[PDB]
């Protein structure tokens, strides 16, 4: 698995979304360079205006591009599953609002690393902070505890993302995540460890469609 990520790899993201029955689709293109834990992606809402805030989709829209240092490579579940790939499923609970359920397949199609997502959202407030677009277009750096899931030959994680509301308060997004190999393995089952993430959101001034430019760095920080 590791050999597939030694250089720069093209990325394709395809998301089909349905929140409270608002149907939408997002297409993403870019490249990842796991040597530096680095990825650059431009996302387009291909159905018009995104019905939810772009920052709420950052975690949903490829942790195989994380930099695992030498002493951590035995804990790299994400690359070990390649090229066949892994399934990444989440529930995202928005405090005092609705929740997303996502299921994604991350795998190689030829030389391209693909992330194909299905997203369903339920119980959102049509005029709340999410469907009302009241979140700031930014993102906080974050650390996540990746835990082994030996029952599923995979990994699992529980973490909190804090979105900035335009009124100066925080919109909490509780994440639960599980990952399993496509095709029943084999994979490296890791010991519990941390990934350190930072994400910069920007916009292409010449791009007239609703879009997000994302620069993301993820590093396996260590066991502790």
Curated annotation (Swiss-Prot):
Effect of residue 197 to Y: Gives rise to yellow-emission variants. In EYFP; leads to yellow fluorescence, folds faster and more efficiently at 37 degrees Celsius and has superior solubility and brightness
Tissue/organ expression: Photocytes.
Phenotypic consequence of residue 99 to T: In EBFP1.2; shifts the excitation and emission spectra to shorter wavelengths and increases quantum yields compared to BFP
Coiled coil residues, start to end: none
Variant or mutagenesis effect after changing residue 169 to G: In GFPA; leads to enhanced fluorescence at 37 degrees Celsius. In Venus; leads to yellow fluorescence, improved maturation and reduced environmental sensitivity
Outcome (variant: residue 139 to A): In Cerulean; leads to improved quantum yield, a higher extinction coefficient and is 2.5-fold brighter than ECFP
Recorded consequence of changing residue 66 to A: Increases fluorescence at warmer temperatures such as 37 degrees Celsius. In GFPmut 3; highly fluorescent mutant when excited at 488 nm
Phenotype when changing residue 165 to V: In EBFP1.2; shifts the excitation and emission spectra to shorter wavelengths and increases quantum yields compared to BFP
Documented applications: Green fluorescent protein has been engineered to produce a vast number of variously colored mutants, fusion proteins, and biosensors. Further generation of mutants led to more stable proteins (at 37 degrees Celsius for example) with brighter fluorescence and longer fluorescence lifetimes.
Mutagenesis or variant effect for residue 156 to Q: In R10-3; matures to the red-emitting state with excitation and emission maxima at 555 and 585 nm, respectively
Listed SUPFAM superfamilies: GFP-like
Post-translational changes noted in the entry: Contains a chromophore consisting of modified amino acid residues. Maturation of the chromophore requires nothing other than molecular oxygen.
Classification via InterPro entries: GFP, GFP-related, Green_fluorescent_prot
Keywords, sorted A to Z: Chromophore, Luminescence, Photoprotein
Family named by the database record: Belongs to the GFP family.
Subunit composition and interactions: Monomer.
Name of the protein described by the UniProt record: Green fluorescent protein
Species of provenance: Aequorea victoria
